[PDB]
A paper describes a structure:
Our biochemical and structural analysis of the E. coli MqsA antitoxin and the MqsR:MqsA-N complex provide a detailed 3-dimensional structural view of the free antitoxin and the TA complex. These structures combined with our biochemical data unequivocally demonstrate that MqsR, a protein previously shown to be critical for biofilm formation and the most highly upregulated gene in persister cells in E. coli, and MqsA form a novel bacterial TA system. Our data show that, as expected for a TA system, the expression of the MqsR toxin leads to growth arrest, while co-expression with its antitoxin, MqsA, rescues the growth arrest phenotype. In addition, MqsR associates with MqsA to form a tight, non-toxic complex and both MqsA alone and the MqsR:MqsA2:MqsR complex bind and regulate the mqsR promoter. MqsA itself is a two-domain protein with a novel fold that, unlike every other antitoxin, is well-ordered throughout its entire sequence and whose structure does not change upon toxin binding.
Residue numbers in the entry:
A (entry chain A): 1 to 70
B (entry chain B): 1 to 97
């Protein structure tokens, strides 16, 4: 299928490390599985993939929200 | 490049979702999270749709064979624009850009 956002890139199954920023902090979310647009940065994910992504996102936000500001 | 009728019958949309035959874009997932909705949350919104929530179906020059059905349900969390495409018996859900 073609990407639902850019409408050009074919979507290809794969793994990527995805940068993520939250409240002035950042991480790279490792080994995110999905269908990745070859043209833009969009991806498509099923339930399992979505839940695992959001768990890493939510783990990182938990870490940042507890972090001391000096 | 727009129609006033949905490309996929809403009964078929719900059948796919009720069979777990659903995927979402990463942007839609993060967007839904801001509204307090997880993946299952998005599925519940889709199964709560009526025909009256339908806005329009649209295609593009880049992908002229593919249609996206746009719905705008009013939720406790606010009014949300969902875009749905059915590709080989899998529902693909995104949010208006
Ligand atoms: Zn794309």
């Amino acid at each position: 299928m073609k990407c639902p956002v850019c409408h050009q890139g074919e979507m290809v199954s794969g793994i990527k490390d995805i940068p993520y920023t939250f409240r002035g902090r950042k991480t790279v979310l490792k080994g995110i599985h999905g269908l990745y647009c070859v043209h833009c940065e969009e991806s498509i994910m099923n339930k399992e993939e979505s839940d695992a992504f959001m768990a890493q996102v939510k783990a990182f936000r938990a870490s940042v929200n507890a972090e001391t500001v000096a | 490049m727009e129609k006033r009728t949905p490309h996929t019958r809403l009964s078929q949309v719900k059948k796919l979702v009720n069979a777990g035959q659903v995927r979402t874009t990463r942007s839609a997932l993060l967007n839904a999270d801001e509204l307090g909705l997880d993946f299952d949350g998005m599925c519940n919104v889709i199964i709560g749709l009526s025909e009256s929530d339908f806005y329009k179906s649209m295609t593009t020059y880049s992908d002229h064979t593919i249609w996206q059905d746009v719905y705008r349900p009013r939720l406790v969390t606010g009014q949300v624009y969902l875009k749905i495409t059915v590709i080989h018996d899998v529902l693909i859900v995104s949010f208006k850009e």
